[PDB]
Amino acid sequence: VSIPINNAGFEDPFIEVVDDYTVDTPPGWTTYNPNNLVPEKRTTWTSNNGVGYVGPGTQFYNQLAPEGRNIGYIYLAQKPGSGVAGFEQILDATLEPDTKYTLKVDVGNFGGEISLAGFPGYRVELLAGDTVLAADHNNLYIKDGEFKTSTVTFTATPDNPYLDQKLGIRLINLLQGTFSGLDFDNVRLTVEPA
Amino acid sequence: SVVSIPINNAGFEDPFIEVVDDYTVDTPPGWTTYNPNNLVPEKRTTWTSNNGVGYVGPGTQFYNQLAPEGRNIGYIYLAQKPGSGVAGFEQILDATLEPDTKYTLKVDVGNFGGEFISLAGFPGYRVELLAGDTVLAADHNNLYIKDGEFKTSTVTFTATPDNPYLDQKLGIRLINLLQGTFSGLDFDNVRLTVEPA
Numbered sequence: 001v002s003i004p005i006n007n008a009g010f011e012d013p014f015i016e017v018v019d020d021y022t023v024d025t026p027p028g029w030t031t032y033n034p035n036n037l038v039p040e041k042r043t044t045w046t047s048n049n050g051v052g053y054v055g056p057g058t059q060f061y062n063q064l065a066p067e068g069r070n071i072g073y074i075y076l077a078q079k080p081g082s083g084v085a086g087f088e089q090i091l092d093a094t095l096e097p098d099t100k101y102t103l104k105v106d107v108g109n110f111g112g113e114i115s116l117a118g119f120p121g122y123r124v125e126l127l128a129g130d131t132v133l134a135a136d137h138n139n140l141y142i143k144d145g146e147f148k149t150s151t152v153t154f155t156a157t158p159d160n161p162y163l164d165q166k167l168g169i170r171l172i173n174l175l176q177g178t179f180s181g182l183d184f185d186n187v188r189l190t191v192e193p194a
Numbered sequence: 195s196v197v198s199i200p201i202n203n204a205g206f207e208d209p210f211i212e213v214v215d216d217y218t219v220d221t222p223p224g225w226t227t228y229n230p231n232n233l234v235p236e237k238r239t240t241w242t243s244n245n246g247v248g249y250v251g252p253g254t255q256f257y258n259q260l261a262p263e264g265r266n267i268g269y270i271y272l273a274q275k276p277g278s279g280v281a282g283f284e285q286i287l288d289a290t291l292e293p294d295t296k297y298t299l300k301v302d303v304g305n306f307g308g309e310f311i312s313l314a315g316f317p318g319y320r321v322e323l324l325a326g327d328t329v330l331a332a333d334h335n336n337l338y339i340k341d342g343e344f345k346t347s348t349v350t351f352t353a354t355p356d357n358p359y360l361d362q363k364l365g366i367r368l369i370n371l372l373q374g375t376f377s378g379l380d381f382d383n384v385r386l387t388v389e390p391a
């Protein structure tokens with residue numbers, strides 16, 4: 001009923017200090033970088049992704065991390081309109097027919113003070129091979145300091161072109177606004193019979 | 195104070211079609227053909243890629259209900275293999291993106307069934323709410339629609355005063371994704387409303 005995802009809640013690496021965070025791609029995820037917005041050689045000033053600690057006393061959120069200690073974030077330095085980037089993970093599971101997939105991700109708009117107000121917008125995708133089967137493109141209004149849960153669902157029929165191809169997830173910073181950073185957490189993919 | 199945004203031929207009711215299950219193969223009034231991948235030729239002949247309007251009236255073979263609104267639906271068919279690109283309808287609206295406003299776009303998306311060369315199967319759809327060239331929010335094939343049925347796609351978007359695209363023209367796209375066969379789908383009942391956030 002549940003499909004396994006590595007580091008699904010970005011709990012690895014463990015981070016001790018409040019509001020600390022990494023600037024390396026979270027383990028178990030690759031950087032989705034179709035427009036080359038995330039450079040090969042990262043700096044703390046460049047487009048970046050990583051993991052962050054949302055602990056008691058966080059200046060980023062009114063709540064704690066939706067799950068565990070940690071969230072995964074994407075930050076883009078380029079100006080709005082330059083493209084997208086984010087997290088991708090291809091799974092060791094395949095598109096199977098008469099099956100309904102439910103992808104749930106929590107999407108965070110962190111606030112605080114540089115000022116962190118505003119949002120670049122998000123997209124969450126369910127892949128089979130290279131094909132986006134279903135995606136939530138920025139449908140939820142998320143206020144600074146809050147998380148909302150994005151849901152993407154998909155049902156494959158026996159006649160689907162992409163059966164037995166590898167399932168995948170993308171979590172995308174759209175860069176359609178500033179402050180152009182956002183957080184994700186608690187990735188969940190469950191199957192049930194159609 | 196919820197108010198709607200004018201859309202031309204929002205229901206594809208223009209033009210009138212008298213005979214049930216008959217259809218035009220030309221771009222519907224008030225809409226342009228979204229063809230970013232040139233999939234739909236300028237002159238259409240029935241078994242080529244085309245789009246148009248179609249009458250869903252009593253006795254239709256194509257659906258387990260009549261049209262969601264009025265007599266007519268808007269359809270898009272693509273003859274290429276699943277994977278070759280996307281095409282559908284676009285209409286740029288008169289209104290412009292406004293701050294502190296929640297937008298609600300609702301569209302009925304249809305998966306016709308039957309035979310004609312077997313119509314079972316579906317290409318995938320995407321509904322987009324636009325400002326300028328920017329897709330603010332979109333429903334990329336999020337609803338499972340059985341052959342013979344319609345489902346209501348909903349796209350919402352709240353504009354903040356810091357939004358980079360204020361005062362750009364609003365737009366709507368209804369897209370055949372070409373990720374399956376039979377590679378035709380219908381649309382109907384396009385509505386866009388605004389209300390304060």
Ligand SMILES: [Ca+2]
Nearest residue numbers: 009067068070
């Ligand atoms: Ca977590």
Ligand SMILES: [Ca+2]
Nearest residue numbers: 020021022023
């Ligand atoms: Ca650090």
Ligand SMILES: [Ca+2]
Nearest residue numbers: 110116117118
């Ligand atoms: Ca923010």
Ligand SMILES: [Ca+2]
Nearest residue numbers: 205263264266
């Ligand atoms: Ca109609």
Ligand SMILES: [Ca+2]
Nearest residue numbers: 306313314315
């Ligand atoms: Ca069909």
Ligand SMILES: [Ca+2]
Nearest residue numbers: 343344345346
């Ligand atoms: Ca229905």
